[PDB]
Amino acid sequence: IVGGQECKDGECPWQALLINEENEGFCGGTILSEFYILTAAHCLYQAKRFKVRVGDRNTEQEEGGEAVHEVEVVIKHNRFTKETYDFDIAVLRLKTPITFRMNVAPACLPERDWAESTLMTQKTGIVSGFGRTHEKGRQSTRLKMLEVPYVDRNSCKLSSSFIITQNMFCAGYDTKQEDACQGDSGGPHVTRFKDTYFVTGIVSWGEGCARKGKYGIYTKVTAFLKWIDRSMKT
Amino acid sequence: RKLCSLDNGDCDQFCHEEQNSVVCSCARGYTLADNGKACIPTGPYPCGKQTL
Ligand SMILES: CNC(=O)c1ccc(N2C=C[C@H](NS(=O)(=O)/C=C/c3ccc(Cl)s3)C2=O)c(F)c1
Ligand SMILES: [Ca+2]
Ligand SMILES: [Mg+2]
């Protein structure tokens, strides 16, 4: 996360981190339930073996809420390809259930029509992660969050050098120095409504981080609600 | 602005328009209150709530 603020105690409880064999994060995730994590399909190419960590806000101290979980089943969208980054979504079923507590809770899955009419028409959404603090910097040792404005779809398509499919949406700023970045991909984009936070996107891709005339591109979760529901039953 | 487009039809969460009237519903883990509008968590650590 470039810019933004630190997630304070209990503010980002649905954050998950995909950690490699060396216990270092390489991608985010969103907690959906005691058994399921939502992430990006493209993250499943960034490490041979990985686990999921929840309840962590500082990677350099033991806060007492941290829990590591092994993955039992990886469910990648069968229409995803690295060539287009379309259908960039996967669900992970954990071997053991997440015990909810301070800093560990699921984000709500919304209904499609209501989310598109009411949540995606709000001014902003919230992205979070342990990713880079600058395009040319190190990963954050602190979980960060950032308010990102929803971006008009026409404006996004004109600013992009790649095809923005029906399965993608844009959020962020034209020139303001705030954006998601390297290591945040697969993480949560949530939208607040009456003090309840609903999953609205997955950090997917960007042409750099926080560049002028460029925005963050997120997987449009609302297009995949039936798919997520199916994946979480098997 | 009418029904659901009018302040979310007074619903806490999901709003639907059936037969010219508002119908509210809630995310899994919540139950719709007796008023047919508010959403009540069924247990601890309900989805979408910051933890206290
Ligand atoms: C359809 N477009 C693509 O196929 C595409 C385009 C650019 C990238 N790409 C190039 C550099 C970026 N790497 S990053 O780790 O810095 C991603 C950063 C993000 C910033 C805001 C986000 Cl939302 S994700 C990248 O993703 C990509 F992965 C796919
Ligand atoms: Ca820690
Ligand atoms: Mg920009």
Side-chain angles (χ1 to χ4, degrees), chain A residues 53-66 130 141:
Chain A
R53 183 193 303 148
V54 297
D56 197 20
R57 294 190 300 118
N58 185 356
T59 61
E60 286 186 336
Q61 282 186 332
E62 306 298 356
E63 308 147 66
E66 302 88 344
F130 285 98
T141 59

Side-chain angles (χ1 to χ4, degrees), chain A residues 60-208:
Chain A
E60 286 186 336
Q61 282 186 332
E62 306 298 356
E63 308 147 66
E66 302 88 344
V68 172
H69 289 266
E70 295 188 338
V71 173
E72 173 182 297
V73 191
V74 175
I75 303 157
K76 187 203 299 293
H77 200 284
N78 73 341
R79 295 170 77 182
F80 169 86
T81 70
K82 186 170 184 182
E83 315 303 331
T84 61
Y85 263 60
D86 205 3
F87 299 89
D88 193 15
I89 182 169
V91 161
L92 316 168
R93 183 183 169 88
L94 303 178
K95 292 190 183 186
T96 66
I98 294 166
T99 308
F100 304 143
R101 54 159 287 120
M102 191 66 181
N103 294 299
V104 187
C108 302
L109 283 168
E111 282 181 347
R112 178 192 72 181
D113 293 356
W114 179 80
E116 295 182 353
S117 294
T118 307
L119 297 179
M120 301 193 68
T121 55
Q122 301 286 318
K123 298 173 190 307
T124 69
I126 299 166
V127 63
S128 56
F130 285 98
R132 296 192 178 195
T133 47
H134 304 285
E135 189 184 348
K136 300 173 184 176
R138 292 172 180 169
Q139 287 208 198
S140 183
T141 59
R142 295 279 183 158
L143 181 52
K144 297 175 75 186
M145 74 183 185
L146 171 67
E147 199 160 345
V148 286
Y150 276 99
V151 171
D152 174 280
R153 190 165 190 90
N154 184 60
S155 304
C156 183
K157 289 184 178 183
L158 290 168
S159 75
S160 177
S161 309
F162 306 85
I163 289 87
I164 307 289
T165 69
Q166 74 283 0
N167 294 318
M168 307 171 186
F169 77 87
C170 318
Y173 297 101
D174 181 359
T175 59
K176 193 186 186 184
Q177 289 303 299
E178 296 186 309
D179 204 11
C181 195
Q182 175 66 240
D184 291 317
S185 79
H189 176 286
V190 297
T191 303
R192 181 185 182 178
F193 185 81
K194 299 186 188 302
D195 298 327
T196 306
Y197 294 82
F198 295 90
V199 185
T200 40
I202 303 166
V203 176
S204 187
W205 62 270
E207 297 190 57

Side-chain angles (χ1 to χ4, degrees), chain A residues 10-11 13-14 100-111 114 118 193-198 229, chain B residues 4-5 7-8 10-16 25-28 30 44-52:
Chain A
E11 290 189 329
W14 37 77
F100 304 143
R101 54 159 287 120
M102 191 66 181
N103 294 299
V104 187
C108 302
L109 283 168
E111 282 181 347
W114 179 80
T118 307
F193 185 81
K194 299 186 188 302
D195 298 327
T196 306
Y197 294 82
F198 295 90
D229 287 346
Chain B
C4 294
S5 60
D7 193 42
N8 198 43
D10 212 29
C11 305
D12 266 7
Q13 297 181 10
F14 316 141
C15 189
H16 321 76
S25 58
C26 306
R28 301 179 209 84
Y30 293 80
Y45 301 102
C47 67
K49 296 298 193 183
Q50 299 177 320
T51 61
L52 303 171

